[PDB]
Amino acid sequence: DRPRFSFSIAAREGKARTGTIEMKRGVIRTPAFMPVGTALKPETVRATGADIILGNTYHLMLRPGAERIAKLGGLHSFMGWDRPILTDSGGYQVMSLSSLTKQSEEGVTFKSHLDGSRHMLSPERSIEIQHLLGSDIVMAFDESTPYPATPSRAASSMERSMRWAKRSRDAFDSRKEQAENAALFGIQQGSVFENLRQQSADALAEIGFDGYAVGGLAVGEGQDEMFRVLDFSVPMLPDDKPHYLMGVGKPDDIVGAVERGIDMFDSVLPTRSGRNGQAFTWDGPINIRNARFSEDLKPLDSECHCAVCQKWSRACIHALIRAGEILGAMLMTEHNIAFYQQLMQKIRDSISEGRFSQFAQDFRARYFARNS
Amino acid sequence: DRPRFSFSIAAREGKARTGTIEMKRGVIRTPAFMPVGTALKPETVRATGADIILGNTYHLMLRPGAERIAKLGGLHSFMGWDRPILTDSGGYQVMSLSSLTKQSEEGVTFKSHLDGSRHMLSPERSIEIQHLLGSDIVMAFDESTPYPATPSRAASSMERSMRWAKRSRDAFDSRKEQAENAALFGIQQGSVFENLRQQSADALAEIGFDGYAVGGLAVGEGQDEMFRVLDFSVPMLPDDKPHYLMGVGKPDDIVGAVERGIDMFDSVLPTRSGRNGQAFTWDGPINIRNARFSEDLKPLDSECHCAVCQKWSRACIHALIRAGEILGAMLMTEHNIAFYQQLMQKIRDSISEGRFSQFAQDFRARYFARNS
Ligand SMILES: O[C@@H]1CC(F)(F)C[C@H]1O
Ligand SMILES: O[C@@H]1CC(F)(F)C[C@H]1O
Ligand SMILES: O[C@H]1CC(F)(F)C[C@@H]1O
Ligand SMILES: O[C@H]1CC(F)(F)C[C@@H]1O
Ligand SMILES: [Zn+2]
Ligand SMILES: [Zn+2]
């Protein structure tokens, strides 16, 4: 009988941790990379090593809608994925994609960018929709602050997000079926300001969550500043719960964030890159359309274990992509997701062995030299 | 205003001829290879160089049926092919694929190998069905004689085929719409027996046809015997009309048959081979699954002009075929059909220049050496 949500840390190296999150639908190895499920077949995504995938609540509530997904048996049935699923709250895409009808402390009303219909989100509505989807990890509904943000705008959005964090907690707790079977994460805000980040961390820990996300990063600030913020922000969160850096990111972002105490990641990059003919390798990204690959019989990456690199050469993936054959994009996408999982596995193994700091240095030296 | 059917011989070398057949729907360059249309897109088949394709009346009358094809606008609309189409009579597949309900001088009744329905063919019914299909070149309905055949069985089938040839002529002539716009070919029979072949040729020329096929070959006799029969059979046919060797064949069969006066060919070989991972080349056929092709960056054939050989290497087609990707079979099939058309073009050009005998010797020396 597996538990609702149990995070265990097996080994540490400095701020880095490796361990497991046990949930009813499966075990998640940490640090973890979550592909964004919202295409490759689900058995392909699983075979790359993914233990959990992410669903975008905003996209799902527009098409086909949360009520429809529930009638179809829930998001796991809808996606053909029977392991854990994390859903975001929808609030970020409201800011970034929709046209706002109204915004206040109550919540937000917005217009679908698809057909113009009006929708509403709030701590209570977001948690309810994530319940209809049936996801395993539920994100609190918060208010995003653009980059760059003034200290006053960062502070007012963080403070609203904390009141909304309490509202998300209470909504999640109001449904026995959700509270007994799913988990709830809260989201730290405060932009780049240490005092606001501490304010936010204190508020989240007072409410109490199963995990803590660092929000408000990866939105234009640059890696140097992101790392500086992580340096003081992650230690503010409870040590014995997972730390989730939302929307990150590039392989070097992931390594440096694990060095700073992050346990969980999501990003569309591997998928977006694969559709655009870009492959991740230990020697940095490559653009497979480049003429130098037309007769290159080596795999995309000569150390990658993925099914694509066992069989397919750069030359033949180049040919497929140049012809516009969808198989080319599928192969690149599978390799990119698998490469990300192999990166996470090397991170986990190196932390376990107490050689992650060295791995990170070796990784950066090679990744940025770009001898591909 | 193009004519119903006009065959012009532009150049000769010994028994070999090159020229054109002008029909309302287009010009056919001879000697001609007809792909069997009954998949690649029709624009792809045209771009390989095919001027005319063949439709199998037996398959079309079983699924979706001739009346349905007519309601859909005819075989040209059904196949997306607006150039000439030759239809066979259906009689060969009756022998080779169906279960016969009844056979007599009247015609034949048979059971569909698909759903067991009963169908009837005869000179009159075959011509009527080919009219419903709307094909440009109509084959007389004849009676096939298996290989090997006794002289008595060869003689009785040839004699019935000639009475049926007259019946086909009269049925075709009975429909003004067909007789004014299509052409009718008769089929010489007689197995390997010179006197029966002459009997058959005399009967066909007395009736009068737009073209003359050599039937009863390519059914197990071997190339040596086929060539021996062609040696005396083709000169018996009218010189100023096209000569059509049905169901042939391998590239070396085609070359030797042109040396013996044949103008037209059809075969499923290029398609069947392409689906099975076999490519035709000037150095003989190759099996692309062979390990020696896994790192071979050369095209399937290093002289072939086809779209596949401009772009795709043996290595990558090997990869596709080994993975079971349908693209692999499509590429092989396109290359094989295009290779056949390039063979016909070299035949036409070499006859025009008076160097076809030399081309044939050079072709065989290289094709059979197999230095691929
Ligand atoms: O149960 C399924 C097995 C799988 F193919 F890996 C995807 C799962 O949802
Ligand atoms: O009219 C069409 C042009 C083509 F693509 F080559 C096939 C014809 O039937
Ligand atoms: O996006 C596709 C693949 C997935 F596994 F991510 C879930 C869905 O079936
Ligand atoms: O078989 C396919 C391709 C063809 F051109 F041969 C006719 C049909 O559309
Ligand atoms: Zn790979
Ligand atoms: Zn070719």
Side-chain angles (χ1 to χ4, degrees), chain A residues 2-23 25-70 72-98 100 104-110 112-117 119-144 146-152 154-175 178-205 207-227 229-249 251-271 273-274 276-325 327-329 331-369 372, chain B residues 2-23 25-70 72-98 100 104-110 112-117 119-144 146-152 154-175 178-205 207-227 229-249 251-271 273-274 276-325 327-329 331-369 372:
Chain A
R2 248 192 318 259
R4 178 189 70 85
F5 188 91
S6 180
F7 179 52
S8 308
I9 294 165
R12 301 171 145 97
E13 181 175 342
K15 294 177 169 181
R17 309 99 72 76
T18 188
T20 54
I21 300 170
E22 293 176 73
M23 304 196 65
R25 283 184 169 98
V27 179
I28 302 152
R29 295 165 290 174
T30 68
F33 180 77
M34 300 180 284
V36 180
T38 47
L40 296 180
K41 299 172 300 178
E43 55 269 30
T44 307
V45 177
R46 172 59 182 166
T48 70
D51 293 327
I52 171 168
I53 59 174
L54 184 148
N56 295 129
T57 294
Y58 171 93
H59 296 301
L60 291 160
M61 72 187 289
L62 297 186
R63 186 158 56 191
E67 295 77 5
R68 176 69 178 160
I69 286 162
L72 289 170
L75 194 55
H76 297 83
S77 302
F78 186 70
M79 295 180 104
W81 176 272
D82 68 358
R83 278 178 182 276
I85 298 175
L86 183 150
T87 49
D88 64 19
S89 80
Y92 183 75
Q93 290 70 31
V94 164
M95 177 184 83
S96 68
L97 303 176
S98 75
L100 258 52
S104 78
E105 189 73 21
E106 183 179 341
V108 299
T109 302
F110 55 97
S112 170
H113 70 288
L114 304 183
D115 72 351
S117 54
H119 298 260
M120 302 184 259
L121 279 180
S122 66
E124 295 80 11
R125 298 166 178 280
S126 174
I127 269 42
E128 174 177 33
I129 287 164
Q130 294 180 73
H131 172 63
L132 285 173
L133 300 174
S135 54
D136 304 283
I137 301 176
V138 173
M139 297 308 299
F141 188 77
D142 67 342
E143 179 176 270
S144 300
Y147 185 77
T150 75
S152 80
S156 64
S157 275
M158 180 276 285
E159 282 175 352
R160 172 173 282 169
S161 292
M162 296 306 88
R163 301 186 290 267
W164 284 5
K166 178 55 156 134
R167 284 171 59 185
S168 296
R169 179 81 261 178
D170 292 344
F172 181 94
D173 290 338
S174 75
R175 277 185 202 83
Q178 191 173 37
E180 290 177 350
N181 296 291
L184 184 68
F185 282 29
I187 304 172
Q188 182 201 45
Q189 294 288 357
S191 191
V192 299
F193 306 106
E194 188 171 10
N195 63 323
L196 304 185
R197 289 275 174 186
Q198 182 71 69
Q199 256 193 266
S200 188
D202 292 347
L204 292 176
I207 300 168
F209 290 93
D210 297 310
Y212 297 86
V214 177
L217 296 174
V219 286
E221 71 277 358
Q223 188 184 82
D224 289 2
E225 196 66 11
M226 185 175 76
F227 284 179
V229 174
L230 290 177
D231 286 337
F232 55 72
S233 294
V234 186
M236 302 169 172
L237 311 171
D239 179 81
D240 67 352
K241 304 289 193 201
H243 308 151
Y244 169 25
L245 184 53
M246 308 180 77
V248 171
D252 50 309
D253 297 321
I254 289 174
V255 172
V258 173
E259 292 179 280
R260 292 168 173 81
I262 298 298
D263 307 300
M264 296 169 57
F265 300 93
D266 73 276
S267 179
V268 301
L269 260 184
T271 299
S273 293
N276 293 338
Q278 171 179 81
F280 289 97
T281 85
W282 293 112
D283 302 293
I286 62 174
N287 176 358
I288 201 58
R289 284 188 176 92
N290 292 352
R292 72 181 186 98
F293 296 121
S294 65
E295 290 190 331
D296 189 340
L297 289 171
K298 299 187 304 298
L300 289 170
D301 181 282
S302 272
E303 293 175 37
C304 181
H305 310 156
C306 87
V308 181
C309 289
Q310 300 316 291
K311 166 169 173 96
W312 296 95
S313 67
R314 288 160 171 196
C316 296
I317 295 168
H318 169 94
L320 288 166
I321 291 287
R322 291 221 53 224
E325 287 288 340
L327 178 63
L331 294 171
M332 296 274 290
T333 298
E334 178 177 358
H335 158 81
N336 283 344
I337 291 173
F339 179 86
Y340 266 62
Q341 295 302 334
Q342 287 168 59
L343 172 63
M344 306 317 297
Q345 184 66 52
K346 287 184 178 285
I347 289 171
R348 295 192 293 261
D349 290 340
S350 70
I351 295 166
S352 295
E353 294 173 12
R355 50 171 190 88
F356 170 61
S357 192
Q358 190 60 52
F359 166 76
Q361 303 181 37
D362 294 348
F363 164 83
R364 284 188 279 272
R366 186 178 171 182
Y367 194 81
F368 289 126
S372 54
Chain B
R2 248 192 318 259
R4 178 189 70 85
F5 188 91
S6 180
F7 179 52
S8 308
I9 294 165
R12 301 171 145 97
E13 181 175 342
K15 294 177 169 181
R17 309 99 72 76
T18 188
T20 54
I21 300 170
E22 293 176 73
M23 304 196 65
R25 283 184 169 98
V27 179
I28 302 152
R29 295 165 290 174
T30 68
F33 180 77
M34 300 180 284
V36 180
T38 47
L40 296 180
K41 299 172 300 178
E43 55 269 30
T44 307
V45 177
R46 172 59 182 166
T48 70
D51 293 327
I52 171 168
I53 59 174
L54 184 148
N56 295 129
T57 294
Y58 171 92
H59 296 301
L60 291 160
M61 72 187 289
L62 297 186
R63 186 158 56 191
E67 295 77 5
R68 176 69 178 160
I69 286 162
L72 289 170
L75 194 55
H76 297 83
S77 302
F78 186 70
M79 295 180 104
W81 176 272
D82 68 358
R83 278 178 182 276
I85 298 175
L86 183 150
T87 49
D88 64 19
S89 80
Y92 183 75
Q93 290 70 31
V94 164
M95 177 184 83
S96 68
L97 303 176
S98 75
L100 258 52
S104 78
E105 189 73 21
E106 183 179 341
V108 299
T109 302
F110 55 97
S112 170
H113 70 288
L114 304 183
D115 72 351
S117 54
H119 298 260
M120 302 184 259
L121 279 180
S122 66
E124 295 80 11
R125 298 166 178 280
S126 174
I127 269 42
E128 174 177 33
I129 287 164
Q130 294 180 73
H131 172 63
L132 285 173
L133 300 174
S135 54
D136 304 283
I137 301 176
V138 173
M139 297 308 299
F141 188 77
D142 67 342
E143 179 176 270
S144 300
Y147 185 77
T150 75
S152 80
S156 64
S157 275
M158 180 276 285
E159 282 175 352
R160 172 173 282 169
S161 292
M162 296 306 88
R163 301 186 290 267
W164 284 5
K166 178 55 156 134
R167 284 171 59 185
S168 296
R169 179 81 261 178
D170 292 344
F172 181 94
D173 290 338
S174 75
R175 277 185 202 83
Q178 191 173 37
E180 290 177 350
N181 296 291
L184 184 68
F185 282 29
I187 304 172
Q188 182 201 45
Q189 294 288 357
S191 191
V192 299
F193 306 106
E194 188 171 10
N195 63 323
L196 304 185
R197 289 275 174 186
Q198 182 71 69
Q199 256 193 266
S200 188
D202 292 347
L204 292 176
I207 300 168
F209 290 93
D210 297 310
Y212 297 86
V214 177
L217 296 174
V219 286
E221 71 277 358
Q223 188 184 82
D224 289 2
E225 196 66 11
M226 185 175 76
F227 284 179
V229 174
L230 290 177
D231 286 337
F232 55 72
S233 294
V234 186
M236 302 169 172
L237 311 171
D239 179 81
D240 67 352
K241 304 289 193 201
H243 308 151
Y244 169 25
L245 184 53
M246 308 180 77
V248 171
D252 50 309
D253 297 321
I254 289 174
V255 172
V258 173
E259 292 179 280
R260 292 168 173 81
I262 298 298
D263 307 300
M264 296 169 57
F265 300 93
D266 73 276
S267 179
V268 301
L269 260 184
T271 299
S273 293
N276 293 338
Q278 171 179 81
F280 289 97
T281 85
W282 293 112
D283 302 293
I286 62 174
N287 176 358
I288 201 58
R289 284 188 176 92
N290 292 352
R292 72 181 186 98
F293 296 121
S294 65
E295 290 190 331
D296 189 340
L297 289 171
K298 299 187 304 298
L300 289 170
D301 181 282
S302 272
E303 293 175 37
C304 181
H305 310 156
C306 87
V308 181
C309 289
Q310 300 316 291
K311 166 169 173 96
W312 296 95
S313 67
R314 288 160 171 196
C316 296
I317 295 168
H318 169 94
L320 288 166
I321 291 287
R322 291 221 53 224
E325 287 288 340
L327 178 63
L331 294 171
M332 296 274 290
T333 298
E334 178 177 358
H335 158 81
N336 283 344
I337 291 173
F339 179 86
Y340 266 62
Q341 295 302 334
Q342 287 168 59
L343 172 63
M344 306 317 297
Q345 184 66 52
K346 287 184 178 285
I347 289 171
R348 295 192 293 261
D349 290 340
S350 70
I351 295 166
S352 295
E353 294 173 12
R355 50 171 190 88
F356 170 61
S357 192
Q358 190 60 52
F359 166 76
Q361 303 181 37
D362 294 348
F363 164 83
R364 284 188 279 272
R366 186 178 171 182
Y367 194 81
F368 289 126
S372 54

